[PDB]
Design a binder for this molecule. Structure first.
Ligand SMILES: C/C=C(/C)C(=O)O[C@H]1C(C)=C2[C@H]([C@@H]1OC(=O)CCCCCCC)[C@@](C)(OC(C)=O)C[C@H](OC(=O)CCC)[C@@]1(O)[C@H]2OC(=O)[C@@]1(C)O
Ligand SMILES: Nc1ncnc2c1ncn2[C@@H]1O[C@H](COP(=O)(O)O)[C@H]2OC3(O[C@H]21)C([N+](=O)[O-])=CC([N+](=O)[O-])C=C3[N+](=O)[O-]
Ligand code: NA
Length: 994
């Protein structure tokens, strides 16, 4: 029964055919269990280890690498040498890389924590029901409860299903619903129907929600819904159905993969088309077997040269380090890839209270009526100092301290403030600073009366915990508080019924004290207090009062106003139905207006500055608040979201107003709106949807279970440090200090990290192009392999991995926050840059092939076969152009591989320098601009010597220590790559200056 809150108790019992005093029969149980299922959220998909190891092997590039591993393994077998250790090395490396990769992918899943699974914290194991088969209450497993069940709850219980309250067995039933409604104070429950079939949860005062807690009392109820149908179950379904997108870089990486894979196959076809003349060779002689091994050897080298194998690790390392840095600035990033998205944020939607403001509420203005004489009226206005919940402050009229007690009107104002109040003050001795005990707005009052000290009680003598509630305790001794009519959003007021404490043979002199939003309270005043006297409420007195409230609430003071009032002749106690909240407005009629208080929940000190940073960075800020609309807009003006004087008629919306717009107008509202007031949790989700319809990258704040869906939907869900764990697990980021400014600082960090990532992505991928040209050159010209997979793999994982990682530490540009958000669709490499890496690639390909071919020919350590061309053969049974001797297999020498490799290494060190800046010359942005980079380059070269010298390794990699002559050639050919880039950077910096 979804609409239970709107049905009578009788109607709810009738629907399920259940007797309140017996409960369900066992036939009913069996039928209801079959119809409605068990009372639980569906279990998580069992994702197995085998099913998960396989997912690691779904990435296209890892597939290519696996294919290459198999050809490399197959080749290690069907071979012609004798060395048993040196062969199976290659396929083991690739295999090991794929395995280490899988190990990690798996680590991340056993440690992954999901939001839907965290909701289960809120289902209790047991609940209590009355069923026909037994007289006494039976404790059963929550999961076996069904709709129609008669259930019983008591103080401390976790609510087990969504239950319509039948009977409250205690004096009141108080419930902790904070997780679902964001109501901090436990809320009173009743049993009468709530008429609106579409009531929001906060109005469902006759309902208990699954997952919430009984704070006081004992109650009988009938189970309305279970499982996925409860409020929290529907929240679990909304999250389930939300599909999150791959980040822009993830999408680019996949696109890169697809294309790279297409290029690879194309180059194979090319290497085939280029050696098509082999169909002209006599079938007799030669070696097909030794030719086919040659095409497969290069296919493997091609695969290895194309993939940036070390890239995922560099990306991960850079992200972890950034993450650690962000945490020191209160931004706890939960998802490493979100860092990029955060850098792209174009809208931040932020709750106000506690995030944009300190949530330290403090009264700084109040007034009572001074006098009323026909058309004439005056008010007595005061200021109150002290922005803390601490009783540190004093009252002033025209900036001069006064005695509060010397105004009877004030005495009553404080009386109402103290009695009509569920909250209080605590002096927390672990911290020193005072903390709210309840609602913030109420504690401001508590704090007010202490500062007012209307009866002049001796407080300078008391301590610091005896200070928290002194002047309050005085006022309590005055009146017996009988009951309270709790605040509700329809009437926007609350009241207390009181009778004199000292009261002999007198049934008379009871008072109700009423506090609430001014408009409805004032409309219900027929009288105005003036000192201790009373006079009829009339037009010019009302004008005067509403006029001041308008200025305090809509002006630059941005205060929340409450009107305070007393009913002088309240109804007889017995003539009041305390059980029907619908009558409460009526009990609070025929009131006497006493006064108005104005309180401020001040903006955080950094907020103004961060709002400005957002405007500078092209990031829109939307405030979401529970203030009325007028005060909402005033506060937006105050912190600079709106200009002091700009028109905002269609840039601010209440939840009400927004609902009244047709769908098309709502989408349009979201694109221009900066302020939403009094909105429901559903609105945050709609706002995010509409914003995603204009391709915004949106951050949204949240704290409760009710915020979880919207946090999941937003590109950057942002949870409060002080909030629920469910909100945390549904978010990309947590603010450990709750501060909006932490968001802005995280975004800037995102922008700077990403700009560095660009450089190292471009740097690593650039070398892969360079490597492929080498392999394709080698197979084009019929040359001996200049580089083998194992070498390339060391370079891609280690040699270039360090400088790439160092490029992550590139100093950020000074104008990072002076530019619009980066377009998500913006390519990492395109246009002129494409051409640059085209040219570098071609250079690098030529330079490596060159060095190997130079050794074979013009080098005097090797067989100076100058223009003798390796082109000719790698056959060696024809022995044509060696007219006399007995030596041939020098085609497998490690020296020319060492030439190529040291060229590759050196060029890449050079190109790491080229990568410090996209377009700035090294003459303006020198190498020492990044110490880590120089440091890494020294480390890579050291390691290059390691594999050249440390004996097990030279043999493994097939290399031989170079000559001082040969190193000098390495440098001769490698260094110019700097010249080429410096020229190319020059061309971009000058003939594209528009
Ligand atoms: C990795 C190694 C090679 C050899 C491969 O060619 O990479 C290409 C490739 C896949 C792209 C290209 C490479 O394209 C070429 O080099 C032209 C083909 C030359 C034929 C060779 C014949 C001997 C990148 C690498 O380089 C150059 C020089 O322009 C740029 C960029 O890469 C990126 O933007 C990085 C995105 C992660 C991509 O065009 C990208 O494809 C895309 O979708 C992008 C948008 O990704
Ligand atoms: N949709 C709404 N409709 C009406 N009032 C609302 C609404 N949403 C919030 N409020 C008011 O805005 C608050 C939370 O702000 P945030 O930090 O969440 O943006 C609320 O505090 C009081 O009224 C609530 C209140 N109370 O019990 O809730 C009792 C009051 N009282 O009489 O003691 C008055 C409150 N008040 O706002 O003045
Ligand atoms: Na999200």
């Amino acid at each position: 029964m979804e609409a239970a809150h709107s049905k009578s108790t009788e109607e709810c019992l009738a629907y399920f055919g259940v007797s309140e005093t017996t409960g369900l029969t066992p036939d009913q149980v069996k039928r209801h269990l079959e119809k409605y299922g068990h009372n639980e959220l569906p279990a998580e998909e069992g994702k197995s280890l085998w099913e998960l190891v396989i997912e690691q092997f779904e990435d296209l590039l890892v597939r290519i690498l696996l294919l290459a591993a198999c050809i490399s393994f197959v080749l290690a077998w069907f071979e012609e040498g004798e060395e048993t250790i040196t062969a199976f090395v290659e396929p083991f490396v690739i295999l090991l890389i794929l395995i280490a990769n899988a190990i990690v992918g798996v680590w991340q899943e056993r440690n992954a924590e999901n939001a839907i699974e965290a909701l289960k914290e809120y289902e209790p194991e047991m609940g209590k029901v009355y069923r026909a088969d037994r007289k006494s209450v039976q404790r059963i497993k929550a999961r076996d409860i069904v709709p129609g069940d008669i259930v019983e709850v008591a103080v401390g219980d976790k609510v087990p299903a969504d239950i319509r309250i039948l009977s409250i067995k205690s004096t009141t039933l108080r419930v902790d619903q904070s997780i679902l409604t964001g109501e901090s104070v436990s809320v009173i429950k009743h049993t009468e129907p709530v008429p609106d079939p579409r009531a929001v949860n906060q109005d469902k005062k006759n309902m208990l929600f699954s997952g919430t807690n009984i704070a006081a009392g004992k109650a009988l109820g009938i189970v309305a819904t279970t499982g996925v149908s409860t409020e929290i179950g529907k929240i679990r379904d909304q999250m389930a159905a939300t599909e999150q997108d791959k980040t822009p870089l993830q999408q680019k990486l996949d696109e890169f993969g697809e294309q790279l894979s297409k290029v690879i196959s194309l180059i194979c076809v090319a290497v085939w088309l280029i050696n098509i003349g082999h169909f002209n060779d006599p079938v007799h002689g030669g070696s097909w077997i030794r030719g086919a091994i040659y095409y497969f050897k290069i296919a493997v080298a091609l695969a290895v040269a194309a993939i940036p194998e070390g890239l995922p690790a560099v990306i991960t390392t850079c992200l972890a380090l950034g993450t650690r840095r962000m945490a020191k600035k209160n931004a706890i990033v939960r998802s490493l890839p979100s860092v990029e998205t955060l850098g792209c944020t174009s809208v931040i939607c932020s709750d106000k209270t506690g995030t944009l403001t300190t949530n330290q509420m403090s009264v700084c203005k109040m007034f009572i009526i001074d006098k009323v004489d026909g058309d004439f009226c005056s008010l007595n206005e005061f200021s109150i100092t002290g922005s803390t919940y601490a009783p540190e402050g004093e009252v002033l009229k025209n900036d001069k301290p006064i005695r509060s007690g010397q105004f009877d009107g004030l005495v009553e104002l404080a009386t109402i403030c103290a009695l009509c109040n569920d909250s209080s003050l605590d002096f927390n001795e672990t911290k020193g600073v005072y903390e709210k005990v309840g609602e913030a707005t109420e504690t401001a009052l508590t704090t007010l009366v202490e500062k007012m000290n209307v009866f002049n009680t001796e407080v300078r003598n008391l301590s610091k915990v005896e200070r928290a509630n002194a002047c309050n305790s005085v006022i309590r001794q005055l009146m017996k508080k009988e009951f309270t009519l709790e605040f509700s959003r329809d009437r926007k007021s609350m009241s207390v019924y009181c009778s004199p404490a000292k009261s002999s043979r007198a049934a008379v002199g009871n008072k109700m004290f009423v506090k609430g939003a001014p408009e409805g309270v004032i409309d219900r005043c027929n009288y105005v207090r003036v000192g201790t006297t009373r006079v009829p409420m009339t037009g010019p007195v009302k004008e005067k009062i509403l006029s001041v409230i308008k200025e305090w609430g809509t002006g630059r003071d941005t205060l929340r106003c409450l009107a305070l009032a007393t009913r002088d002749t309240p109804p007889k106690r017995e003539e009041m139905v305390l059980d029907d909240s619908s009558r409460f407005m009526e009990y609070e009629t025929d009131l006497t207006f006493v006064g108005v208080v104005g309180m401020l929940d001040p903006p955080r000190k950094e907020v103004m500055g961060s709002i400005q940073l957002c405007r500078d960075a092209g990031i829109r800020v939307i405030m979401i608040t529970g203030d009325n609309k007028g005060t909402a807009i005033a506060i937006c003006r105050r912190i600079g979201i709106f200009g002091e004087n700009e028109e905002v008629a269609d840039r601010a919306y209440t939840g009400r107003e927004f609902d009244d717009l047709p769908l098309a107008e709502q989408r349009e509202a979201c694109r221009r709106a900066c302020c939403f007031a009094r909105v429901e949790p559903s609105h945050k989700s709609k706002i995010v949807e509409y914003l995603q319809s204009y391709d915004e990258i949106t951050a949204m704040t949240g704290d409760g279970v009710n915020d979880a869906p919207a946090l999941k939907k937003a590109e950057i869900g942002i949870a409060m440090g002080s909030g629920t764990a469910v909100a945390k697990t549904a978010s990309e980021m947590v603010l450990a200090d709750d501060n909006f400014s932490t968001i802005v600082a995280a975004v800037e960090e995102g922008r700077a990290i990403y700009n560095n990532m660009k450089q190292f992505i471009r740097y690593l991928i650039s070398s892969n192009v360079g490597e492929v040209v080498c392999i394709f050159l080698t197979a084009a010209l019929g040359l001996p392999e200049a580089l083998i997979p194992v070498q390339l793999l060391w370079v891609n994982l280690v040699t270039d991995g360090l400088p790439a990682t160092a490029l992550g530490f590139n100093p950020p540009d000074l104008d990072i926050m002076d530019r619009p958000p980066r377009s998500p669709k913006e390519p990492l490499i395109s246009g002129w840059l494409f051409f640059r890496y085209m040219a570098i690639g071609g250079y690098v390909g030529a330079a490596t092939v060159g060095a190997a071919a130079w050794w074979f020919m013009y080098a005097e350590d090797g067989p100076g076969v100058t223009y003798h061309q390796l082109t000719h053969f790698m056959q060696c049974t024809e022995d044509h152009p060696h007219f006399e001797g007995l030596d041939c297999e020098i085609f497998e020498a490690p020296e020319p591989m060492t030439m190529a490799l040291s060229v590759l290494v050196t060029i890449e060190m050079c190109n790491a320098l080229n990568s410090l800046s996209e377009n700035q010359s090294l003459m303006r942005m020198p190498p020492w601009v990044n110490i880590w980079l120089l440091g890494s380059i020294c480390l890579s070269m050291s390691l290059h010597f390691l594999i050249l010298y440390v004996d097990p390794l030279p043999m493994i990699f097939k290399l031989k220590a170079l000559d001082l002559t040969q190193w000098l050639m390495v440098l001769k050919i490698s260094l110019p790559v700097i010249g080429l880039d410096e020229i190319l950077k020059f061309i971009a910096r000058n003939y594209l200056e528009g």
